[PDB]
């Protein structure tokens, strides 16, 4: 077994976390419990606090952000690691007990609970003109020594450790996607009608999507082209829900359909990041520091969706458009979930919403 | 000597 370890810039404070990724199980989240090693002689009269902060943030991580910025703490938790709380939540876990028995008396545990209605760690891709600034939900843990919570933390004696909330593909498969749409002319009784379907409801990252387009064109109009696309639906919710669409994959072939003739094909399309690096607002999975993460996984939400909405929600749909002569374009959308398998209102808010729509809507 | 900002490493939960 192993545990992550980050220390203070002066070395008088250290944080130990067993994990950096915490999985939402749709009824519970992986509890954030770690160990903080302090120097009681260094802290003559100060206390040690650890914070579990998750915030909707716009702008990069530096201080000289030339332009607009926005932050909104979606959830704040505070723990007084030293002196230890008289009634700490939960008994220390096995890993925490081992860490305490390894590090000695100057190590103390901290416990955090992530609420069930929080977003996952997501990041919207900055635009080529945008100077690294990007929307995104970020989880973090900061340990600092201070007289109280209200006292400002100092860089020398504080240490930050970015954590992530993640989700994985449910074991139970969902219903197979299927969509139907018809477009009949004003005079002819025949009605153009296509069928499309994905072979699966859930696809892993890098896994191709096979769509079964099935066109039954009994009318007198000819389908010039058949376009198959994958679209990403980032759903940013702060105080007003705003949906954003980004096309992430396109398969287009010149397969004309003659009047009074059926059609059937199995198109293959794969969403991937190689051709989408120049797109702004493209939701990507949470990055620890700067690594390349793939496209954002689809956000799975509970049936108990009373509100359940915060941060950014990601959804994927496959669109099959037929470009028909003399107008009359008919389309079908196939919503699918794209995940990873389990390993084995204030003025600032309203103004930022206006800004977000103007930028990436 | 290491005056740069400490990064995240790991340690074995033993002894």
């Amino acid at each position, epitope marked *: 077994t192993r545990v992550f370890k980050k220390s203070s810039p002066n070395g008088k404070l250290t944080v130990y976390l067993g994990k950096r990724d915490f999985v939402d199980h749709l009824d519970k989240v992986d509890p954030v419990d770690g160990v903080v090693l302090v120097d009681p002689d260094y802290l003559k009269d100060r206390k040690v606090f650890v914070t579990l902060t998750v915030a909707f943030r716009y702008g990069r991580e530096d201080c000289d952000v030339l332009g607009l910025s926005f932050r909104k703490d979606l959830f704040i938790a505070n723990y007084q690691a030293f002196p230890p709380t008289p009634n700490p939540p939960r008994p220390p876990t096995r890993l925490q007990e081992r860490l305490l028995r390894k590090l000695g008396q100057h190590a103390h545990p901290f416990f955090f609970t992530i609420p069930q209605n929080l977003p996952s760690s997501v990041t919207l891709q900055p635009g080529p003109e945008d100077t690294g600034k990007a929307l995104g939900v970020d989880f973090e843990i900061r340990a600092f020594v201070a007289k109280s919570l209200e006292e400002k933390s100092h860089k020398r004696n504080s240490v930050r450790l970015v954590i992530r909330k993640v989700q994985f593909a449910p074991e139970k498969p969902g219903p197979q996607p299927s969509a139907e749409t018809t477009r009949h002319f004003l005079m002819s009784d025949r009605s153009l009608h296509l069928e499309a379907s994905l072979d699966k409801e859930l696809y*892993y990252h890098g896994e191709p999507l096979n769509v079964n387009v099935h066109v039954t064109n009994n009318s007198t109009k000819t389908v010039k082209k058949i376009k198959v696309s994958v679209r990403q639906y980032a759903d940013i919710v702060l105080f007003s829900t705003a949906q954003y669409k980004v096309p992430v994959a396109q398969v287009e072939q010149d397969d004309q359909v003659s009047p009074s003739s059926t059609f059937s094909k199995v198109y293959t399309i794969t969403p991937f990041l*190689a051709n989408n690096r120049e797109k702004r607002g493209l939701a990507l999975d949470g990055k620890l520091k700067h690594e390349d993460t793939n496209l954002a996984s689809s956000t799975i939400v509970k049936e108990g969706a009373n509100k359940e909405v915060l941060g950014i929600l990601v959804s994927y749909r496959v669109k099959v458009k037929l470009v028909v002569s003399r107008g009359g374009d008919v389309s079908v959308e196939l919503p699918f979930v794209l995940m990873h398998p389990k390993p084995h209102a204030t003025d600032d808010d309203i103004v930022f919403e206006d800004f977000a729509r103007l930028r990436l809507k | 000597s290491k005056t740069f900002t400490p990064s995240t490493t790991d340690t*074995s939960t033993r002894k």
Partner: antibody
Amino acid sequence: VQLVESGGGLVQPGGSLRLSCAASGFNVYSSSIHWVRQAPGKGLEWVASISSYYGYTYYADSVKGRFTISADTSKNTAYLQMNSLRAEDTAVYYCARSRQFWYSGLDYWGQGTLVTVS
Amino acid sequence: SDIQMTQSPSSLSASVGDRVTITCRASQSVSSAVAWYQQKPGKAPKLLIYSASSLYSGVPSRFSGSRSGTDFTLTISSLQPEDFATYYCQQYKYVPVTFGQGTKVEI
């Protein structure tokens, strides 16, 4: 799941050769493809790697510039275009395969194409 | 700079039922991102251990991996005649991925 290779052979020093790696049983975007060579009597050495999901190609310092690695995503095959083949390039080149999400070693290997120079 | 995986010993003589430990030391402090391979002569390599401890699927349970800081060890608890081969130590934390020089196991 196979990593059939083809393309190696005898090449005059300073010549050129292309190695084709016919991948099967997995997708070019959920897996990365790496070229690893093993000179006679010498250990394993990594020369190239391509990530078609991210569009990244990496090369060893001894093959940078001289070697180019490409992928035929539609054909689910990878290529290694080796140019200016010197004496140090003689080896048995293996097409290895690793996961994209995430790297857990080269779980699938080819069978090696013997590349020699005169 | 690159990272050297100093694999020791370069070779060793063993016998059936013996316990063989092959060490690997990284010049730079890589994480658990270390893999082990078994290359019999005339054949392509075969992944045995990944993440320095995770046994690859299908590999016999007699192989095991461990890490002590930057020192990685491959152990065969009950060596079999099928295990006489060359074993390579690879790190994949940083590009380029570097391999150990190998450890030929001989009867």
